Design a protein that fits this description.
part of a larger assembly; 8 chains; A mainly beta; B mainly beta; D mainly beta; E mainly beta; B: mainly beta; 32% strand; elongated; E: six-stranded antiparallel beta sheet; four-stranded antiparallel beta sheet; 2 helices; 4% helix; 29% strand; binds palmitic acid; Capsid protein VP3 (chain B)
């Protein structure tokens, strides 16, 4: 049950991986998880703030 | 093991009314206790028991 | 009392009063001397963590 | 199969078990519920503590002797200092609740006696001096029970309650107290007595400090007796559970 | 996965889940929602570490012994028996009968002995371990013919690499390994009493194939058992007392448990 | 209708009646049956005596005193000299059987006490001298019961059993003996105790003289007590019934 | 003849295994066998006991 | 992949992207094409090295300790705690709560000690490392029975090959490892204050299985942690100050930053 995924290559190829142990805590690190959501910290306000609008009106 | 961060509580027993007996009967009785676990009970982290011990190999 | 069958007996007699205590111990199923040597306690010692509800039956 | 003698009652984190009990008495046919919208008066939103207030509170025990006239308890005052029920009734202005009273007395097959347990609504009591009205320390004793007398209380210039028992303090005939919700504890048959009284009043809610809605009376119509050799100390225990308790009018703590 | 608590409410009924009778030898199956009000909880805990395979399948040292490259004690012998180490013995005795495969691992380590011999320049040591089933010949000396291992299983190991390890199948003339035996060997009800009666497991021998050096060297071998594919029957209570010998269940009477100050004290 | 207290057991030409009994304990969930063909080893044809061997044999009674540590019986040895069961087990080489143990003790409503009845499989016992193993005259006493001790047995150079009771002779904690099939005789509730143990062993059959498969232990966790004027002699009786007994390997009579 | 099974992972991934020896006594331990049946010990009585019922009637 | 700049032109409007109000606790989301004219740029840069898994999944030395083959210090013990090394501690304390698997690697290295003993010819050294979870027995001496590891995890390593390495799952009675704890152990609000309250991780012991030689030898063990499958919550500011102890957050007051000459100076 091999898993084929894509390699980290430049911009402007695949690799194969097999799990050998029955404990999921032995697998390799989850390196490719490029998901970001800065909205919890940068803009935590109750009311939406349009950029091109007076913050206080 | 003993850990304050995970303290369990206290179990106590009290007299509600009294033990009442007639004449020619013993006013002293005994109670017995049995402990067991329910369906939700679980255990983790297998380790060695601090009860058994030995100084030299038995023969 | 640990060197007899009296350790398992909880004495309850007729009391000329009310609301006094019979016994008490902490909810430490594997560390307290009341519980560390019972089947539950014995099995618990081989592990580090426990979870779930407990049954105490009184006869 | 099952029997009618055994019965368990669960409320909050409290369970009451009995193996020799008579049928439960439910008030005037009514089960305690909450106040509806077509019957309310106070406009703000009430708070229902539920499990924290609707549970079994046990009181002190009293000893049943061969010459005990009887005891009584003003129900709302009795619990005014127990757990979160007392605190909620101390921080609020109006309250509403029904009750579940369980009275317990156990003895052997060689003991005899009979106790009347009656929940009397609005048991207004009289004073020994016709001139005045009785004190609050005489009428309601919290954290304890109030004892009746076998002989009439003397008159004078005081504020004592007329605790004569055959008059029930209310100036009536005691044998008629079976017009109210009641239960008999007969030592040869009964073991305990349960009564589930709903909220009785002429207003939708009431202040719980200056008014006592009901009263628990325990009277031994037939005296306690036994033969030399049997147990001589026989106590009586009372456990009260509030039901559908709600509170309205949050204010500062106190009763003045 | 453990059971999930069911949410309950207030009750006033003739049902009696709390009241039972313990004289029937039956454990009450009461859940917490029978004596109080509860909430619905979604339990996700697993009972995956309480399994007998997980509880017993871990390597344990059951014995270790020494031999030398010169002098008198030139080889080591050990009748196979796990009841010398307390830990694994107490784990197995939880049940009356067991049935498992075995995984053997050997940790062989040498040490140089103090002496006055000079110009010592040792070559790598090779060890031989040999298993003799009950009935076969035994090595009266170190350079005897029995070490030819024509049929007897044996392992050659050169010091410096991975420890030797083998797999042993369930070897028993019966249907299960008996942890306890209440009887004798002879029909005359005298002689050997107890589990020593069923201990017909063979013998393990160990030696140096070469001497290595001109100076003295002592090699210690540690044996490790690891049960696999475990089956077990009829659970028993734990030992409580301290073990005394390897062939019998003899003990010294001990108190039920340790004490406290009163029946109301919340402290050990 | 019928009650759960009353129960009759018929085996052979023997009927046991009881009017105050707890539920029957059936082994490890298994009912004693015969050996099947896919599980047998000995090739010849076995003999099943049925009614002649599967019936109730009563043993001697023991007296329950206020200071009795307890008793035990090696089940196979106990009946090795009774009726045709003993004869069949004396003329054959291999045997196989389950059991039905009924323990009886009756007392009044003014007596108290509690006895633990436990069928322990492979109860290997220990010696008072760590150096040796106990004698067969110490371990198994036929036609009688073997008594426990309240104090530890002294050491020396003998072959005595370590009959200390709180250690159960097996060097364990006695309160854990409820891991095996068991039943409690409580004088205020119970009257007798029934246990239906099947054939437990690691081989399909066994010689019945040099090996004891199970053992009956009777221990009074709560002592016997009464007040002056009531009966002082209280006996305990044990009745064992073999079930599905079969024999293989006919030979000359004897055990050597 | 590879055997693909599921790994032991938390709540709220697969692994591959091949047998190399012809003796079944050489395989890995049977770790994932979560089957329990406490009824042989907790309730071994002949007659069923309903929980919300008087044990003695 | 980072966002791509949008090309803009000259504007004359009542829109005010630059003017904002910072008292609302909100960061302005202004792009450069709001205050100037820009060109269209196709950005190809990736944020693949700023991920918490990439930032934290690297092995770090958290401790090292010594033991000997003779004399007094015959074994080594260490209550597991990462707050002894500054680097990994400061990396983790970026967040309030974390949750990760662990990858342990051990670098064991021996050295010969100065002495006057002659004719030294050492055999290969084997080491044992043993983990005791909180509650189990401890090795009072070097040749005690606890080293049988019947249930306790342990690793046997012979000097000369690949360093030993294992995987540890997220071991916590809670839902996350707390890097900071603002409270006490006792309900009486006295006693142990701080994160030492939640440090119930077990103990690690290390020894030589054989002595190897007749002369003295000291072995040092270095422990390396490597978080895997990391989750983190509630980011905090960096330490700034220098650490003092391993059990608390005590510090010595330090200036906000380093200085310069004036408010107009372009030099450190
Ligand atoms: C080259 C070395 C080979 C060694 C082979 C060893 C085979 C014998 C294994 C003995 C296992 C004993 C298990 C006892 C179990 C029990 O009764 O509790
Ligand atoms: C044979 C050696 C086995 C070693 C097993 C070690 C298991 C314990 C690991 C401890 C991890 C501690 C993580 C702390 C994280 C934190 O709170 O910041």
């Amino acid at each position: 049950g091999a898993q084929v995924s894509t390699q980290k290559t430049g911009a402007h190829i695949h690799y194969t991986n097999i799990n050998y142990y029955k404990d999921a805590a032995s697998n390799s690190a989850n390196r490719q998880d490029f998901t970001q959501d800065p909205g919890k910290f940068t803009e935590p306000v109750k009311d939406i703030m349009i950029k091109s609008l007076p913050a206080l009106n | 093991t003993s850990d304050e961060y995970t303290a369990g509580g206290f179990i106590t027993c009290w007299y509600q009314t009294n033990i009442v007996v007639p004449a020619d009967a013993q006013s002293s009785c005994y109670i017995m206790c049995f402990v067991s676990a329910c369906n939700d009970f679980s255990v983790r982290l297998l380790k060695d028991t601090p009860f058994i011990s030995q100084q030299n190999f038995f023969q | 009392k640990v060197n007899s069958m009296e350790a398992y007996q909880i004495p309850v007699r007729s009391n000329e009063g009310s609301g006094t205590q019979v016994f008490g111990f902490p909810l430490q199923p594997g560390y307290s001397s009341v519980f560390s040597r019972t089947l539950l306690g014995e099995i618990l010692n081989y592990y580090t963590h426990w979870s779930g509800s407990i049954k105490l039956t009184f006869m | 199969g099952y029997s009618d003698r055994a019965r368990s009652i669960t409320l909050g984190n409290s369970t009451i078990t009995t193996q020799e009990c008579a049928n439960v008495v439910v008030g005037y046919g009514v089960w305690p519920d909450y106040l509806k919208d077509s019957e309310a008066t106070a406009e703000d939103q009430p708070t229902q503590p539920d499990v924290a207030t609707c549970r079994f509170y046990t009181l002190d025990s009293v000893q049943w002797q061969k010459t005990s006239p009887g005891w009584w308890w003003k129900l709302p005052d009795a619990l005014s200092n127990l757990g979160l029920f007392g605190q909620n009734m101390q921080y609020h202005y109006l309250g509403r609740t029904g009750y579940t009273v369980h009275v317990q007395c156990n003895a052997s097959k060689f003991h005899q006696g009979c106790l009347l347990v009656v929940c009397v609504p609005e048991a207004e009591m009289g004073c020994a001096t016709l001139d005045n009205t009785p004190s609050s320390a005489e009428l309601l004793g919290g954290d304890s029970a109030k004892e009746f007398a076998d002989k009439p209380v003397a008159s004078g210039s005081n504020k004592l309650v007329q605790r004569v028992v055959y008059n029930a303090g209310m100036g009536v005939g005691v044998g008629n107290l079976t017009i109210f919700p009641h239960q008999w504890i007969n030592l040869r048959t009964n073991n305990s007595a349960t009564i589930v009284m709903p909220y009785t009043n002429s207003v939708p809610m009431d202040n719980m400090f200056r008014h006592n809605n009901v009263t628990l009376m325990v009277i031994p119509f037939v005296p306690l007796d036994y033969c030399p050799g049997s147990t001589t100390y026989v106590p009586i225990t009372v456990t009260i559970a509030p039901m559908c308790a709600e509170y309205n009018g949050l204010r500062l703590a106190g009763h003045q | 996965r453990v059971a999930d608590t069911v949410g309950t409410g207030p009750t006033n009924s003739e049902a009696i889940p709390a009241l039972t009778a313990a004289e029937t030898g039956h454990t009450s199956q009461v859940v917490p929602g029978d004596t109080m009000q509860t909430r619905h909880v979604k339990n996700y805990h697993s009972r995956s570490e309480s399994t007998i395979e997980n509880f017993l399948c871990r390597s344990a040292c059951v014995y270790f012994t020494e031999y030398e490259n010169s002098g008198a004690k030139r080889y080591a012998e050990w009748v196979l028996t796990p009841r010398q180490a307390a830990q694994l013995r107490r784990k197995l005795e939880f049940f009356t009968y067991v049935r498992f495969d075995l995984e053997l691992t050997f940790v062989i380590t040498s040490t140089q002995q103090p002496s006055t011999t000079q110009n010592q320049d040792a070559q790598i040591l090779t060890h031989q371990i040999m298993y003799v089933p009950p009935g076969g010949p035994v090595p009266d000396k170190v350079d005897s013919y029995v070490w030819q291992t024509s049929t007897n299983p044996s392992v050659f190991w050169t010091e410096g690499n991975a420890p030797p390890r083998m797999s042993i199948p369930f070897l028993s003339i019966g249907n299960a390994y008996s942890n306890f035996y209440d009887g004798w060997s002879e029909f005359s009800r005298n002689g050997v009493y107890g589990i020593n009666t069923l201990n017909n497991m063979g013998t393990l021998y160990a030696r140096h194939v070469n001497a290595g050096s001109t100076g003295p060297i002592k090699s210690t071998i540690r044996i490790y058992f690891k049960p696999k594919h475990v089956k077990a029957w009829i659970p028993r209570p734990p030992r409580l007392c301290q073990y005394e010998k390897a062939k019998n269940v003899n003990f010294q009477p001990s108190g039920v448990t340790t004490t406290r100050q009163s029946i109301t004290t919340m402290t050990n």
